[PDB]
Amino acid sequence: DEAEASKFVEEYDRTSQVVWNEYAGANWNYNTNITTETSKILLQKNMQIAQHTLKYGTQARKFDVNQLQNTTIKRIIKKVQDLERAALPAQELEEYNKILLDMETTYSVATVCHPQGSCLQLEPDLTNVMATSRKYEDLLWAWEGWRDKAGRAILQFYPKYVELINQAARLNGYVDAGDSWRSMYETPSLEQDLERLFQELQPLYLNLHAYVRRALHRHYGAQHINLEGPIPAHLLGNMWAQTWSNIYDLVVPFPSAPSMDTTEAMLKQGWTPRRMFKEADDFFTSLGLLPVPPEFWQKSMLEKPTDGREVVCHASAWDFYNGKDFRIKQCTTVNLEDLVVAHHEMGHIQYFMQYKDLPVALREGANPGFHEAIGDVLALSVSTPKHLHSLNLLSSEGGSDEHDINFLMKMALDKIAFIPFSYLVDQWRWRVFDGSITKENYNQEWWSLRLKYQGLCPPVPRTQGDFDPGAKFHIPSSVPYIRYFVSFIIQFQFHEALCQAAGHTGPLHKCDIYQSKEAGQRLATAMKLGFSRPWPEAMQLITGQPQMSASAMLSYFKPLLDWLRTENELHGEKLGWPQYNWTPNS
Numbered sequence: 001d002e003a004e005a006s007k008f009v010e011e012y013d014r015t016s017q018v019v020w021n022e023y024a025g026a027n028w029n030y031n032t033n034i035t036t037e038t039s040k041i042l043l044q045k046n047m048q049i050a051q052h053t054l055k056y057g058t059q060a061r062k063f064d065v066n067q068l069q070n071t072t073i074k075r076i077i078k079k080v081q082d083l084e085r086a087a088l089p090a091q092e093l094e095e096y097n098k099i100l101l102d103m104e105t106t107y108s109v110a111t112v113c114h115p116q117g118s119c120l121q122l123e124p125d126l127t128n129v130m131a132t133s134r135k136y137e138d139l140l141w142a143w144e145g146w147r148d149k150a151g152r153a154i155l156q157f158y159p160k161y162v163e164l165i166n167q168a169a170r171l172n173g174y175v176d177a178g179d180s181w182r183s184m185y186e187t188p189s190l191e192q193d194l195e196r197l198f199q200e201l202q203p204l205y206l207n208l209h210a211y212v213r214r215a216l217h218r219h220y221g222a223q224h225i226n227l228e229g230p231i232p233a234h235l236l237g238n239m240w241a242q243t244w245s246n247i248y249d250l251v252v253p254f255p256s257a258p259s260m261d262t263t264e265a266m267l268k269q270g271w272t273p274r275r276m277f278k279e280a281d282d283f284f285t286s287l288g289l290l291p292v293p294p295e296f297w298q299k300s301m302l303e304k305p306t307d308g309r310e311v312v313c314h315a316s317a318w319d320f321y322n323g324k325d326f327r328i329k330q331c332t333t334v335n336l337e338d339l340v341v342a343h344h345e346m347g348h349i350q351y352f353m354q355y356k357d358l359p360v361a362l363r364e365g366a367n368p369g370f371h372e373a374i375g376d377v378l379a380l381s382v383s384t385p386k387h388l389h390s391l392n393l394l395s396s397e398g399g400s401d402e403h404d405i406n407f408l409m410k411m412a413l414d415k416i417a418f419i420p421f422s423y424l425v426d427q428w429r430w431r432v433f434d435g436s437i438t439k440e441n442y443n444q445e446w447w448s449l450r451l452k453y454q455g456l457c458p459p460v461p462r463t464q465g466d467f468d469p470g471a472k473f474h475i476p477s478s479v480p481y482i483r484y485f486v487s488f489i490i491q492f493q494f495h496e497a498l499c500q501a502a503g504h505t506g507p508l509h510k511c512d513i514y515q516s517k518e519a520g521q522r523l524a525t526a527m528k529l530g531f532s533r534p535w536p537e538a539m540q541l542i543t544g545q546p547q548m549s550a551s552a553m554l555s556y557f558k559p560l561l562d563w564l565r566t567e568n569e570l571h572g573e574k575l576g577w578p579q580y581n582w583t584p585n586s
């Protein structure tokens with residue numbers, strides 16, 4: 001009967017709110033205070049939430065969702081039938097929870113030490129070395145050292161993690177954990193759709209890569225850069241070479257049109273982490289969207305503690321499943337890169353507030369890419385030179401074609417360079433999960449993809465025992481990655497649509513949607529759906545059509561594509577890395 005199924009979902013919602021709120025609290029308390037005691041409590045709460053998931057999931061599987069008429073009830077029940085790791089026998093469940101905590105903790109406490117010298121943490125110390133050092137050997141020390149300490153230490157856990165996450169997936173009716181993850185998109189054509197989008201971005205990426213490679217050749221020397229080969233992976237300003245904008249100084253298209261040092265401007269003008277989040281809050285409310293609650297300011301961790309606590313620094317946003325308590329945990333540094341991250345995280349909080357009155361089972365983004373995209377959309381407007389000048393972080397840069405191309409390059413170094421990285425991470429993990437890549441070949445297959453998609457090579461040959469994927473947060477934390485590929489594509493579609501709704505004319509990259517209530521309304525209507533409808537409906541509400549499409553990103557960067565093609569042709573660049581086997585001689 002429809003009536004027993006409606007009652008079931010009402011009971012599930014009531015009880016899940018309580019249990020999920022308790023689990024979220026214990027998880028937060030460990031993430032913001034890594035201790036033996038908080039780990040023990042977290043593992044205990046893990047068994048408590050598993051008992052609830054098993055109880056209600058077992059009930060849900062007694063309903064034949066075929067017979068169910070109401071589609072929202074059918075949708076909730078189908079979801080609750082997936083027990084996730086609560087499908088595991090008790091011993092394997094305890095083992096999985098411990099392995100996950102061990103991997104997460106290992107990553108978040110790893111340090112890289114000089115001999116009889118200081119020990120560096122990833123945030124801020126190694127991040128700053130990668131961003132600012134311009135000495136090959138110092139960058140190599142940080143790049144190799146991080147992999148030696150964090151990556152190699154994850155390897156002992158990863159095969160058993162794979163076994164257990166796959167076992168749970170099979171117990172819930174999937175073939176492996178990658179199948180489970182991909183199912184979040186409810187899109188049978190997902191793999192083909194993502195491949196087509198990746199291929200559309202190749203002209204831009206290959207041209208950007210060749211131009212940056214030439215600039216690296218100029219700085220690091222002809223003996224260290226092959227103009228027809230892959231780029232050494234430690235030279236791009238970022239530990240993972242996933243975003244390249246920190247080497248803007250090495251690649252600036254028009255050096256005669258310099259930009260104000262934004263870090264020094266933020267520091268000289270007294271910006272703090274709290275100010276950064278307040279500015280993001282102001283952008284959301286300028287669109288008519290919701291302010292974060294007072295409680296957010298009391299309870300969030302917006303900077304690394306100075307009091308002796310060890311924490312998980314990697315920035316993240318937290319819903320406590322009570323409609324009131326939402327928090328960010330970020331070890332914020334005062335610079336423009338982290339201002340963008342603060343917007344990314346504030347977008348999650350906005351989504352949490354928008355869907356807070358849906359049943360908890362539907363309190364998720366339309367798909368995981370939508371969740372990661374919202375804050376980045378607003379940050380596209382914040383990042384415009386006009387907006388940054390309004391914040392007194394740049395001088396006036398308008399009315400200058402040189403400044404225009406410089407800005408597009410700054411944006412491409414992050415947004416375009418990230419496309420191949422974000423594509424490859426779960427290409428690797430899906431093949432680990434499906435058994436195509438074994439522990440014998442984890443690292444070799446990672447580097448084959450880093451070459452194939454990003455055109456990068458490791459500066460030091462890898463050795464048996466290396467596990468470089470473990471040195472990237474999302475791997476030991478079991479956070480899917482294709483969401484970020486989707487996000488980077490769709491955030492430009494959203495920007496284009498919101499700019500049109502705001503009445504902007506002229507080139508897309510000049511748009512700033514600040515204060516547009518029409519733009520806010522598009523976003524709010526879509527976010528309020530949560531996970532209640534197939535994601536093409538939310539896509540339609542924002543953009544006027546239902547597909548994912550690279551057209552908006554291509555339009556944004558069209559003037560830079562034209563500039564890059566002319567520049568690369570002038571210098572005779574060979575796009576790609578036809579000398580694909582090249583690696584550094586020294």
Ligand SMILES: *[C@@H]1O[C@H](CO[C@@H]2O[C@@H](C)[C@@H](O)[C@@H](O)[C@@H]2O)[C@@H](O[C@@H]2O[C@H](CO)[C@@H](O[C@@H]3O[C@H](CO)[C@@H](O)[C@H](O)[C@@H]3O)[C@H](O)[C@H]2NC(C)=O)[C@H](O)[C@H]1NC(C)=O
Pocket residue numbers: 006007009010070071072073357358359532
């Ligand atoms: C299929 O069932 C859904 C879900 O119904 C809700 O959840 C069930 C478990 C039961 O507890 C129901 O009693 C309960 O309504 C129906 O969706 C719901 O429809 C109602 C009626 O339009 C929506 O009410 C609105 O609520 C807002 C505030 O939240 C008011 O301001 C509005 O004026 C309006 O009254 C409700 O939001 C909506 N809920 C969800 C989660 O979608 C759905 O109508 C039903 N389908 C059919 C064809 O009957």
Ligand SMILES: *[C@@H]1O[C@H](CO)[C@@H](O[C@@H]2O[C@H](CO)[C@@H](O)[C@H](O)[C@H]2NC(C)=O)[C@H](O)[C@H]1NC(C)=O
Pocket residue numbers: 033035037038309
């Ligand atoms: C970090 O975690 C430790 C361990 O849970 C906290 O110390 C506990 O604090 C509670 C309440 O303050 C006491 O009831 C326990 O007896 C304490 N346990 C130990 C082993 O000291 C500590 O307060 C936490 N720090 C922060 C800043 O939250």
Ligand SMILES: O=C(N[C@H]1CCS[C@H]2CCC[C@@H](C(=O)O)N2C1=O)[C@@H](S)Cc1ccccc1
Pocket residue numbers: 082083084085180181183184364368479480
């Ligand atoms: O993405 C996430 N959670 C995903 C992880 C990848 S798989 C996916 C599909 C199958 C069911 C369930 C499973 O893990 O088994 N599930 C998840 O929880 C976290 S970051 C955000 C989120 C939280 C709650 C609900 C939805 C999203």
Ligand SMILES: O=C(N[C@H]1CCS[C@H]2CCC[C@@H](C(=O)O)N2C1=O)[C@@H](S)Cc1ccccc1
Pocket residue numbers: 314315316317341344345348372479484
């Ligand atoms: O997404 C996240 N954090 C950001 C912070 C930096 S910006 C952003 C965009 C670029 C791609 C990706 C990157 O840095 O690898 N990324 C992030 O990881 C968090 S909300 C993911 C998470 C969710 C729940 C629990 C734990 C983590």
Ligand SMILES: O=C(N[C@H]1CCS[C@H]2CCC[C@@H](C(=O)O)N2C1=O)[C@@H](S)Cc1ccccc1
Pocket residue numbers: 027046049084085086100477478479480
């Ligand atoms: O939300 C996530 N991961 C969830 C997936 C859905 S189930 C949930 C409840 C039971 C315990 C635990 C489990 O069984 O894996 N768990 C998860 O890890 C990831 S994406 C985000 C995240 C990562 C690290 C710390 C905090 C958040």
Ligand SMILES: [Cl-]
Pocket residue numbers: 240468469
């Ligand atoms: Cl790597």
Ligand SMILES: [Cl-]
Pocket residue numbers: 181184368369480481482483484
């Ligand atoms: Cl995903």
Ligand SMILES: [Zn+2]
Pocket residue numbers: 344345348371372
């Ligand atoms: Zn995020």
